[PDB]
């Protein structure tokens, strides 16, 4: 099927582009219902939780915003009290009540019923022995549990988690012990990054804190003695933050799942809805942007294009904010349609050197490419280069047929350049060809495939369609259009399957066609299964609207061959009888 | 490296 401009157009119409946007800020976790309900359950139950999602989602900002709205009972005062001159314990009193117990003791069961063991052990034998380090150490206190303590420690070192012993010259005492993140988060929330616990080697010590209440201030190797610090009942909720991959290290520890029961997973995409466009606008305004309707619409549509889905939008608020900040500079402080389009263009320019070199090499004939005419056994497939920002390029492919003993040879795979999935695609094509053409017994052909100017590894199955049509062309002696690039995976039954990076692929063929001078007949054949992924850039949409570029969507390899060879498989003088006649020719050459 |  031909894809009209109207079928390809995906962008949001803009009405009153320059009108200022006025919208209220959305709640924390907008469009992230799964993660929000997980966190609500963790808050309601006192459970430890982990926030999981790809980088640049805004996971940290959403979490701190949501925790800021919570309310708990005012946290107890928290202190170290000495039970001896070599031993300390962590104590909670009701709030504000340690400043009284400090004055009392500075009177060198009075009404501090919980502070007993400190006082009991505070008894006598200075008078009994003339024996010449003893007053309580307040770690924390606060006025209200609204908002609760919220401690985000990105740097999960033992001293930052557990506190430190200072040494006043050597000795030490209760009064020289500094609190850590764990102490500051009591009655509230400690937030840590999974990657920092791994990188800092503090995961085992952290588990000992949560499982056993072992919280040991960091000491030093010199100090001729230390204090014993008694374990204490931990009163805190821990929320870990990280990527799926940051967690996988931790997840192989059975203790991880035991301690962190509540998974709060962010979706990498939201529905592309009016409500999520509106929420994005209110979010950008709350960040301080001066947003026009046109600037909101373009950012919203760039989020859809980022997701490579007409119906979804990229959920990475941090990535949308960074693009908006570059737009705001190009707009002199105003976030407009133009400033967004021009920020996108300047990103591509700043990463274009590789493509400028490639396009110059094609123009000079140093890379041999055809974008017009016809040739047997040759096709432009499409690839993306595996370095950000993943530019697409045509990849010239040849198929040559000789009389032989049913061999399909991938030259790139035999030379070691082709990966396992690339190999799988060649095997799959072999299975299709052998089973499709059985009249002579096993295929009377040896077919060799080569990516002609490929010096580097190729992986993926998306050149399967180009490889199969090249192969059929070589068998039947079928001239194929070189003005249409081909992308698609094939199954053993000859059906065309979805491929990745379809926008980069299409745009990369358009870019080469344009650099060599558009003929008016160039285009791409791609999988019908990718229609929902097509969010093509303005310049390609306008070329298709102008009749200067053409998109074809297919379901079968044979539908692709019919377009490339300019004929039907049947209505015979069709391609199928030419393919059969080529196989009969090869079979005769192969026997006597 | 390229990717199809």
TrEMBL record, chain A:
<dbReference type="Pfam" id="PF13654">
    <property type="entry name" value="AAA_32"/>
</dbReference>
<dbReference type="InterPro" id="IPR041699">
    <property type="entry name" value="AAA_32"/>
</dbReference>
<protein>
    <recommendedName>
        <fullName>endopeptidase La</fullName>
        <ecNumber>3.4.21.53</ecNumber>
    </recommendedName>
</protein>
<dbReference type="InterPro" id="IPR046843">
    <property type="entry name" value="LonB_AAA-LID"/>
</dbReference>
<dbReference type="InterPro" id="IPR014721">
    <property type="entry name" value="Ribsml_uS5_D2-typ_fold_subgr"/>
</dbReference>
<feature type="active site">
    <location>
        <position position="462"/>
    </location>
</feature>
<dbReference type="GO" id="GO:0004176">
    <property type="term" value="F:ATP-dependent peptidase activity"/>
</dbReference>
<dbReference type="Pfam" id="PF05362">
    <property type="entry name" value="Lon_C"/>
</dbReference>
<dbReference type="GO" id="GO:0030163">
    <property type="term" value="P:protein catabolic process"/>
</dbReference>
<dbReference type="InterPro" id="IPR027417">
    <property type="entry name" value="P-loop_NTPase"/>
</dbReference>
<feature type="domain" description="Lon proteolytic">
    <location>
        <begin position="447"/>
        <end position="567"/>
    </location>
</feature>
<dbReference type="InterPro" id="IPR020568">
    <property type="entry name" value="Ribosomal_Su5_D2-typ_SF"/>
</dbReference>
<keyword id="KW-0720">Serine protease</keyword>
<dbReference type="Pfam" id="PF20436">
    <property type="entry name" value="LonB_AAA-LID"/>
</dbReference>
<dbReference type="GO" id="GO:0004252">
    <property type="term" value="F:serine-type endopeptidase activity"/>
</dbReference>
<feature type="active site">
    <location>
        <position position="505"/>
    </location>
</feature>
<dbReference type="GO" id="GO:0005524">
    <property type="term" value="F:ATP binding"/>
</dbReference>
<keyword id="KW-0645">Protease</keyword>
<comment type="similarity">
    <text>Belongs to the peptidase S16 family.</text>
</comment>
<dbReference type="InterPro" id="IPR027065">
    <property type="entry name" value="Lon_Prtase"/>
</dbReference>
<keyword id="KW-0378">Hydrolase</keyword>
<dbReference type="InterPro" id="IPR008269">
    <property type="entry name" value="Lon_proteolytic"/>
</dbReference>
<dbReference type="GO" id="GO:0006508">
    <property type="term" value="P:proteolysis"/>
</dbReference>
């Amino acid at each position: 099927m031909r894809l009209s401009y109207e079928a390809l157009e995906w962008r949001t119409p803009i009405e009153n582009s320059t009108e200022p946007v006025s919208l209220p800020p959305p709640p924390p976790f907008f469009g992230q219902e799964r993660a929000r309900e997980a966190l609500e359950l963790a808050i309601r139950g006192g459970f430890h939780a982990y926030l999981v999602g790809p980088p640049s989602l805004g996971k940290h900002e959403a979490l701190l915003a949501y925790l800021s709205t919570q309310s708990v009972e005012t946290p107890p005062d928290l202190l170290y009290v000495p039970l001896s001159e070599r031993k300390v314990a962590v104590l909670t009193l009701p709030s504000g009540q340690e400043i009284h117990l400090a004055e009392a003791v500075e009177g060198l069961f009075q009404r501090f019923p919980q502070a007993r063991a400190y006082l009991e052990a505070l008894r006598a034998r200075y008078a009994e022995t003339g024996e010449p380090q003893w007053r309580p150490n307040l770690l924390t206190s606060s006025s209200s549990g609204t908002p609760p303590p919220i401690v985000y420690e990105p740097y999960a070192t033992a001293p930052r988690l557990f506190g430190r012993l200072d040494y006043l010259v050597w000795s030490t005492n209760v009064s020289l012990i500094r609190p850590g993140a764990v102490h500051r988060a009591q009655g509230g929330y400690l937030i840590l990054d999974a990657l920092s616990l791994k990188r800092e080697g503090t995961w085992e010590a952290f588990k000992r804190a949560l499982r056993n209440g072992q919280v040991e201030p960091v000491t030093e190797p010199q100090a001729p003695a230390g204090l014993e610090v008694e374990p204490f009942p931990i009163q805190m909720q821990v929320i870990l933050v990280g990527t799926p991959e940051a967690f996988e290290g931790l997840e192989e520890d059975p203790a991880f799942s035991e301690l962190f029961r509540i998974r709060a997973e962010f979706s990498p995409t939201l529905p592309a809805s009016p409500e999520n466009c509106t929420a994005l606008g209110g979010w950008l305004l709350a960040q301080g942007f001066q947003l026009t309707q046109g600037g909101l619409t373009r950012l919203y549509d760039e989020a859809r294009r980022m997701a490579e889905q007409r119906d979804r939008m990229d959920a990475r608020l941090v990535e949308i904010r960074a693009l908006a900040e570059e737009a705001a500079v190009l707009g002199g402080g105003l976030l407009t349609a133009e400033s967004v389009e021009q920020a996108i263009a300047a990103r591509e320019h700043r990463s274009f050197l590789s493509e400028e070199e490639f396009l110059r090499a094609v123009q000079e004939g140093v890379i041999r490419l055809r974008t017009t005419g016809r040739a047997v056994g040759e096709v432009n497939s499409l690839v993306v280069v595996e370095a950000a920002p993943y530019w697409g390029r045509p990849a010239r492919l040849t198929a040559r047929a000789a009389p032989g003993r049913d061999h399909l040879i991938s030259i790139d795979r035999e030379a070691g350049l082709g990966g396992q999935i690339f190999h799988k695609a060649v095997l799959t094509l072999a299975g299709y060809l052998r089973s499709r053409y059985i009249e002579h017994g096993s295929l009377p052909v040896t077919i060799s495939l080569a990516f002609e100017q490929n010096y580097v590894s190729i992986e993926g199955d998306a050149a399967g369609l180009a490889e199969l049509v090249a192969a059929l062309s070589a068998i039947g002696n079928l001239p194929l259009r070189q003005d249409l690039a081909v992308t698609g995976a094939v199954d053993q039954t000859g059906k065309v399957l979805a491929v990745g990076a379809i926008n980069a692929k299409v745009e990369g063929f358009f870019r080469v066609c344009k650099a060599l001078g558009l003929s008016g007949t160039q285009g791409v054949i791609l999988p019908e299964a990718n229609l929902a992924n097509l969010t093509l850039r303005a310049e390609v949409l306008e070329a298709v609207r102008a009749g200067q570029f053409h998109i074809y969507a297919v379901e079968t390899a044979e539908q692709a061959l019919e377009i490339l060879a300019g004929a039907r498989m049947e209505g015979f003088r069709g391609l199928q009888e030419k393919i059969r006649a080529g196989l009969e020719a090869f079979a005769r050459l192969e026997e006597g | 490296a390229v990717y199809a």
